[PDB]
Design a protein around this ligand. Structure first.
Ligand SMILES: Nc1ccn([C@@H]2O[C@H](CO)[C@@H](O)[C@H]2O)c(=O)n1
Ligand SMILES: Nc1ccn([C@@H]2O[C@H](CO)[C@@H](O)[C@H]2O)c(=O)n1
Ligand SMILES: [Ca+2]
Ligand SMILES: [Ca+2]
Ligand SMILES: [Zn+2]
Ligand SMILES: [Zn+2]
Lengths: 543, 543
DNA sequence: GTTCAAGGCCAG
DNA sequence: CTGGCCTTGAAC
């Protein structure tokens, strides 16, 4: 499917591909290996599919966060560049290409938020958030705002929050801890409450989105806005005289934006891994290669030290690199999705004032965080055998998705409330945006009883955006051959996909919800026999 | 429009009207004069309009504060009850129905804040505010707060503030002094700093509102709350065992809640003024009449001495009357509105810590306190004639309303700062809530110049909730007769209603902003002639 | 003395 | 087979 002696490179349309193609022409001139660069559409989507088939490009350029998902699917070769080459680039950029303890791509370019101020309105920008209210009151008298940015999305408000002891997941020796989230913290609450103190006094109306702040800053209304290089071009045509500089410091500590690293990764299916490493290390990652790419379309800051020094002569790019070094690498692991969501609401609720700060942040932390089951508890509660009728507690492992896999976890029995009802209360306390459907998956020790089938099927009638599937280990009946079969048929009428957990489902649960301590799943005796038994009884019930 | 030999009575819906109707039935049984009681909606709003047309009710029941606004519009008949009858009611209640030196209504009922405590948690309530922090530390150990009330509104926090030499306006014999405000005082600062000392140690979280404190007290969390009789019914259904007692004393002096007096006023347009006085003096204001009204819906404490003694057997009502006698009558004059606002913010800014105490209180006092303009200075500075070009200070009288007339005053020239810019700095230092529009009115010696016009029109672009109208005595100029006209046309574009002061405007200013010593306005020669002349030049300028 | 995981036997 | 019922070894 994929050739030898030929290099195929995939790069997005907004990044300069003509300069990269000219680099490949230099590589072909010197070596004889012909290089072809392509800028397809949705290549961040196209690449996983074509690569799962042993096809696709030899090299893939994209932001480093997606590369973690590519690395979990084994689509990326491991690279071991000499430490003599690892120096050549800034050290923190090599951490963005590290997944599960091994390097999966080459750092190329750097992006991060930075402070954009009006030089005419502000000849000397403030170095601290603490000076912002005062400044605003002086500029609210000329009909101007001091600062406006995209307060809705968490990528923009997060730097102030994380400036003081705030973080998503602690990093260590090239691996994140999904169990630990610094969303709830003294300093995170300090930054968020400072934000709220700005919006209460209406230094920021709190309804500000990206376009309201871009229209505001670009038409001369606001003196400062927090944004990245992606928008620079616009401000250059607005004729506004401006500048980029360090994001202000809260409590004296630098604020921490989320750094995105444009990276070049190697397809694991490629026979040209070494050809690729030679091209990347000796032709792309040079002053001449990155400059040739840059003249076509900007790269922002670059990871290559020498060329980054040549580019820092631009004060804007210098600011980008400075805020990047004072910030934190945007994590590449899956749980980050559940993070964004769990934060995207928590700031908004604390912004409008419809929820207090510590409530929004505690709810955010416990939402986007790990809770893992026990192994002995799981093995005991989920055994599908005979003689399992003597089990009382029902356990329920859940996954909420849309495909963005949001929160996951497990619930158990508590004071007469069967688990299904507790999940109804959990997903009800959790707000919903009924313009988008959600796909909710259940893994239950016992299938729902009649009361649970009726309550759940009703909840499903009322929120028709939700679509539920239920995998149960065991079929529950009290007063056999009357009620629960009709209840399960009632959930069937409501369109609930009811299956009985097969072996692959027990693997999924074992590696998804349980704390296995890297232990392989161990099937007990009679698992498959009881599974096709119970699935037979179920096919007898519904149909 | 309004009948003779018939009495029509207006009373709010929350006050017992069936008992009052039975009193009117007794009056009809004795005299033959039929009495009809009605409880319309927004009768406090409906009454001024219907009465301005010589219509409406014969008698109106409402809190005494609104009656001052009815008295200024001449809608209330003056009453001269014999001293023998005035001795029947408590003397301080007669000061609440006194406006501009003459009685306008009959006192009926009395309301005031009182201390409500949990008898189970607190068998012996503290008599002094000084004991409150210690008691809180003892109850913070059982999971309870000692005291929680509505710290947002000034009606609730004012008793402690005024406990030591604090007051709104000094009252010399039924007459308030708008020029004197005791908001800034040694004892006022003592009470406010003690409140801040309670919120720094978090004996009160300072975000507490009326409903947070009612839910807290009624669910058993807090041991004491400061409230009035309006909420008693709720605490009765909460099954909480409680009591009402004296508000605690600060520095040994009784704290001063604001006393509200439910009053019965006579419509000045009624031919039945004497029928009304007979019904009120001999049928309503009796033990039998007030008891008949009370059995239907409670009146709280009453102004009639004998029946008040009969009701004091209820220790709650006795507490209400005691705090009322130790408090001060809530003034009925218009400036009280500027008072509430100027105080509502001043305590909040001193509560959060975003403004020091003496700053919040000095800003509050100078905010809500009259400030009046020398007659000679006004007459000199506002003369519209010719030969007025030789005047170089510019004065500006302002009114800020929403309807709701907040602060008024005048402003003048400074070291190169024209007035308009000084007013921009004043209304900027004054905070704004950009969810509500404000209507600001100007009265200026000179119309704004080009720099003024531009700065003001910009301020209006940035704060689009403000709507400005400018009345000017004179039109200003400087060579570029071109400009002073284009600047005024730019303010016209911004939506500023520009008019030139007519005679009625001079009357308004003369009786609103000037210290006239009760002297009628004296127009100089050529006022009207120069007025239509300048108005002609202005029409010629804008259109 | 007791409660439970597990498994087998027998009668529908 | 599916469901009902005893035996057991072994664990608090
Ligand atoms: N869907 C279901 C059905 C049943 N159960 C368990 O069975 C008992 C009902 O009497 C309950 O004690 C309950 O533990 C459950 O947990 N979930
Ligand atoms: N709109 C205006 C215009 C002018 N002025 C006062 O009049 C003088 C004009 O030179 C100036 O000295 C200035 O003080 C003013 O007070 N307000
Ligand atoms: Ca969770
Ligand atoms: Ca004032
Ligand atoms: Zn159930
Ligand atoms: Zn001016």
């Amino acid at each position: 499917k994929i050739e030898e002696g030929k290099l195929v490179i995939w790069i997005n349309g907004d990044k300069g591909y003509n300069g990269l193609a000219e680099v490949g022409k230099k590589f072909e001139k010197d070596t004889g290996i012909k290089v072809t660069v392509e800028h397809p559409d949705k290549l961040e989507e196209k690449f996983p599919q074509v690569a799962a088939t042993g096809d696709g490009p030899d090299i893939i350029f994209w932001a480093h966060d997606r590369f973690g998902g590519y690395a979990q699917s084994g689509l990326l070769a491991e690279i071991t560049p000499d430490k003599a080459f690892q120096d050549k680039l800034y050290p923190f950029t090599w951490d963005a290409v590290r997944y599960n303890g091994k390097l999966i791509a080459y750092p190329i370019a750097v992006e991060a938020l930075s402070l954009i101020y009006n030089k005419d309105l502000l000849p000397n920008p403030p170095k601290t958030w603490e000076e912002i209210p005062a400044l605003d009151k002086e500029l609210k008298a000329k009909g101007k705002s001091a600062l406006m940015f995209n307060l809705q999305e968490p990528y923009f408000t997060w730097p102030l929050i994380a400036a003081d002891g705030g973080y998503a997941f602690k990093y260590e020796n090239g691996k994140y801890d999904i169990k630990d989230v610094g969303v709830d913290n003294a300093g995170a609450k300090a930054g968020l409450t400072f934000l709220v103190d700005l919006i209460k006094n209406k230094h920021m109306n709190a309804d500000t989105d990206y376009s309201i702040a871009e229209a505001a800053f670009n038409k001369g209304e606001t003196a400062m806005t927090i944004n990245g290089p992606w928008a620079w071009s616009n401000i250059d045509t607005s004729k506004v005289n401006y500048g980029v500089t360090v994001l202000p410091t809260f409590k004296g500590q630098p604020s921490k934006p989320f750094v995105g690293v444009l990276s070049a990764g190697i397809n694991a299916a490629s026979p040209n891994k070494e050809l690729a490493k030679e091209f990347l290390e000796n032709y792309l990652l040079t002053d001449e290669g990155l400059e040739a790419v840059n003249k076509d379309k900007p790269l922002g800051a670059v990871a290559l030290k020498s060329y980054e020094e040549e580019l820092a002569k631009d004060p804007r790019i210098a600011a980008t690199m400075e805020n990047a070094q004072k910030g934190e690498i945007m994590p590449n692991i899956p749980q980050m999705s559940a993070f964004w969501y769990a934060v995207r609401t928590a700031v908004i609720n604390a912004a409008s004032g419809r929820q207090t700060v510590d409530e929004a942040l505690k709810d955010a932390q416990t939402n986007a965080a790990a809770e893992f089951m026990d192994p002995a508890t799981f093995t005991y509660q989920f055994k599908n055998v005979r003689w399992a009728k003597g089990r009382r507690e029902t356990y329920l492992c859940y996954v909420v998705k849309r495909s963005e896999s949001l929160d996951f976890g497990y619930l158990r029995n508590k004071n007469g409330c069967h688990v299904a009802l507790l999940f109804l209360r959990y997903i009800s306390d959790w707000d919903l945006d009924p313009g988008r459907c959600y796909r909710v998956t259940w893994f239950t020790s016992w299938s729902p009883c009649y009361d649970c089938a009726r309550h759940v099927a009703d909840f499903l009638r009322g929120n028709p955006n939700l679509s539920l599937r239920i995998f149960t280990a065991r079929l529950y009946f009290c007063e056999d051959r009357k009620a629960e079969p009709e209840g399960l048929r009632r959930l069937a009428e409501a369109g609930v996909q009811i299956a009985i957990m097969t072996y692959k489902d027990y693997e999924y649960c074992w590696n998804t919800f349980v704390e296995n301590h890297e232990r392989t799943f161990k099937a007990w005796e009679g698992l498959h026999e009881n599974s096709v038994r119970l699935s037979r009884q179920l096919r007898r019930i519904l149909q």
